[PDB]
Amino acid sequence: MTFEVDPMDEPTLLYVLFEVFDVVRVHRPHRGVIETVYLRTPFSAGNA
Amino acid sequence: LYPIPANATNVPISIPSRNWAAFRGWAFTRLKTKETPSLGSGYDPYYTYS
Amino acid sequence: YMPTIKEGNSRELMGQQSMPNRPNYIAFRDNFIGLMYYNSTGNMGVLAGQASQLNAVVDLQDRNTELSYQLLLDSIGDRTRYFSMWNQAVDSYDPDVRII
Amino acid sequence: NSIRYSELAPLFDTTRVYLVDNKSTDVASLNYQNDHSNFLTTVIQNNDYSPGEASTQTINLDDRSHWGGDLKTILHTNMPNVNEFMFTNKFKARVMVSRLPTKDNQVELKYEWVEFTLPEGNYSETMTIDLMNNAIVEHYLKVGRQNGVLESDIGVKFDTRNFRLGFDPVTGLVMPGVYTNEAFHPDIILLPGCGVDFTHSRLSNLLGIRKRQPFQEGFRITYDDLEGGNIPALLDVDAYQASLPVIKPLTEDSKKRSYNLISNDSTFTQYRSWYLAYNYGDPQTGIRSWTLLCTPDVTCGSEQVYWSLPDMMQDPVTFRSTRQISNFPVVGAELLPVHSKSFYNDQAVYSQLIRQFTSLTHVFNRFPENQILARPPAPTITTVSENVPALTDHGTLPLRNSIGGVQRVTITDARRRTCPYVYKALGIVSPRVLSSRTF
């Protein structure tokens, strides 16, 4: 991606929201046990 | 967060190579480095802004 | 306006003129942004079982949990209303001050 | 078998994942307040992204298997002898504060336990005892002499020699009239009402004075505790040959610094010695009953360090999963790499005499005419602390089935805190299958 911005006399940033599917599935199979499986995509990270 | 130098115009970014399955779209806004703290740490010492 | 650099009292210090200081509102942020370590992977919070050693909060760096809650309150309800318990008072400039 | 990574092909068993502190600088936004003991490093090491953009991705071991990693760690420190962190600069010692007279024909002595701090640095055991004797005089030059306490009654003196080699038991004095200039062991020298306190200190391990029962709290050595260890007085050899048979215990010096004798008609001084009460006192009830003679050990003890990888190792038995910076689940124990290497020269006292002429200053050689308050002899058997690297094998450790990209390495002290003097940490984990988790 190639952006063109107006010039500013200050160090500025660029905040791009790459919209993903940041999804949790919480599984509590026993009493006192909580175990989640995470998945996000395209920026892939999680248990799935 | 991509850095833009002072008085810069062309900002080329590059996501290197990823599986883009189920991509949804973009949304972007220019921020300032002065007004954006470096999150991830217990304390940002280079952040003199409130 | 200081007419004379000398700190001692003189006739010229009857002409010194006073201006009020700029109004500075220091408060907690809207929806208590900044109190909680979200998305800091070194200060990541825990919700797990007491005997279970597996954390159910696997928080990442490039997630923005604060902005995900600011945009959530916009859609699920009115945002011009003030809720003091979560300190839910949205940042809002005056429309006659920004755009003259 | 699959050690599957998301952005590449699924590898199979026995890969290597690396936890290096150099890549904890590649992601510097996480660790602005983290040393090389406790730090957040990355593991992913995919060269497509950035030094820091690949940190969020995970390494998923398979959930069907129970995984075990062969931990191999490289540790290297630069720890000085005298430092604030390992409690080797502080020692408490009760000293004589003020010698002031009362109304009629009575003097009253004021005492106070004063905290004595050493300059931080890597020293020998000759110069540290010179610094430990310097802190007694620095309190004397600041608090002591401004009230009126004399030079003869400076309380605590850290010496390294024997005061009972010229001792003739028929006469009761030291026959050469000068104590020997050879060093045997570091002892302490006290006066009535003064003592030391090595409870929160660790220079007790430097003087070679350890407890016979170390598991009780508190370690103070008092004038009352050193019973039977009076330093014998010196024979007046200038008068023993002037009338040659007269026998006189020596009372003063060339500068009239009087030896503290217990009376006018005695052969012992008021100066005690830890070395004399240990070897020549009572073995049943004396200081030998609860102290111990040691190698002087310029490392000041070798504690252990505790490796802990909380975000990829499963916690061992009876360890609770917690995120406290002082308390992590320990996955590997290791000795601190500061070894103590020996050293021997027979000219260690003669090299100390050149050391005064080279330094050109009498700071360490204050009181040169007084025999007890003279500079201690350097020992012929010293010790040299060496920082050695330590590649160790922590064996197979059970792994968490989903390893995140950012991983914490914490090198924890024996008192459960982070060591500032670690500057090289490198963990190497080899994941392999231990047993199946599903039938």
Give the DSSP letter string of D136-152: HHHHIIIIITTTT--ST
For C31, phi and psi rounded to 5 degrees? 60, 25
Gap positions in chain B, given as the residue before each gap (C–N > 2.5 A)? Answer: none
Q: Which amino acid is at D62?
A: D
Looking at CA atoms only, how far is residue B25 from chain A in angstroms?
A: 5
Cα first-last separation, chain C: 29
Method used for this model? cryo-EM
Instruction: Please name the fold of domain D2-78+304-335+394-437.
Output: Jelly Rolls (2.60.120)
Question: How far apart (Å, rounded) are the C-alpha atoms in residues C54 and C42?
Answer: 16
Question: How far apart (Å, rounded) are the C-alpha atoms in residues D39 and D410?
Answer: 7
Question: How far apart (Å, rounded) are the C-alpha atoms in residues D159 and D419?
Answer: 32
Residue D327 makes CB contacts below 8 A (sequence gap 6+) with D416
Neighbours of D306 (CB within 10 A): 18
Among D356, D352, D358, CA closest to D382 = D352
What is the C-alpha R_g of chain A?
19
Question: How far apart (Å, rounded) are the C-alpha atoms in residues D116 and D142?
Answer: 13
Question: How far apart (Å, rounded) are the C-alpha atoms in residues C100 and D22?
Answer: 53
Measure Cα distances from D395 to C8, D72, D311, D384 in Å: 78, 8, 18, 31
Contact D268, D232 (CB under 8 A): yes
Contact D398, D66 (CB under 8 A): yes
D31 shares contact with chain B (CB less than 8 Å): yes
Contact A24, A38 (CB under 8 A): yes
**What tokens were used for C70?**
């600011």
Residue C54: closest C-alpha in chain D: D321
- In what side-by-side order are the strands of the sheet with D220-222? D107-117, D90-101, D195-197, D220-222
| Strand (E) or helix (H) holding D91 | strand D90-101
Name every chain A residue with its beta carbon within 8 A of the beta carbon of C51. 32
| Strand (E) or helix (H) holding C95 | helix C95-98
* Sign, CA torsion D12/D14/D19/D23: negative
**What tokens were used for D119?**
């300059």
**Helix or strand or coil: residue D158?**
strand
Resolution in A: 3.2
Question: How far apart (Å, rounded) are the C-alpha atoms in residues D125 and D183?
Answer: 12
H-type alpha helices, D319-432: 348-359
CA contacts within 13 A on the Cβ side of D183: 28
Q: Which amino acid is at D433?
A: V
Question: How far apart (Å, rounded) are the C-alpha atoms in residues D78 and D85?
Answer: 13
**What tokens were used for D430?**
């080899």
Contact B35, A18 (CB under 8 A): no
In chain D, residues under CATH classification 2.60.120.550 are 2-78+304-335+394-437
Q: Which CATH number fits domain D89-294+336-387: 2.70.70.10, 3.40.50.280, 3.40.640.10, 3.90.1620.10?
A: 3.90.1620.10
Q: Which amino acid is at C1?
A: Y
Question: Pick from D30, D31, D49: which is nearest to B16 by CB?
Answer: D49
Among D50, D69, D52, CA closest to D3 = D69
Among D163, D211, D157, D213, CA closest to D184 = D163
In chain D, residues under CATH classification 3.90.1620.10 are 89-294+336-387
- DSSP codes of every residue in D214-233: TTSS--EEETTTSTT-EEEP
Neighbours of B14 (CB within 10 A): 10
Phi-psi group of A4: left, alpha or beta (phi > 0 → left; psi -120 to 50 → alpha; rest → beta): beta
Looking at CA atoms only, how far is residue B40 from chain C in angstroms?
A: 4
Looking at CA atoms only, how far is residue B12 from chain C in angstroms?
A: 20
Test the A interface: residue of B1, B10, B11 with most A CBs within 10 Å: B11
C53 shares contact with chain A (CB less than 8 Å): no
Contact D47, D8 (CB under 8 A): no
Question: How far apart (Å, rounded) are the C-alpha atoms in residues D264 and D95?
Answer: 25
Chain A neighbors (3+ CB pairs < 8 Å): B, C, D
Measure Cα distances from D431 to A35, D11, D41, D319 in Å: 22, 11, 18, 21
Bridge-based pairing state of the strands D338-344 and D390-398: unpaired
D33 and B38 in contact by Cβ < 8 A? Answer: no
Among D306, D314, D278, CA closest to D67 = D314
**Helix or strand or coil: residue D128?**
helix
- In what side-by-side order are the strands of the sheet with D406-412? D39-42, D406-412, D304-308, D332-335
Name every chain B residue with its beta carbon within 8 A of the beta carbon of D48. 16-17
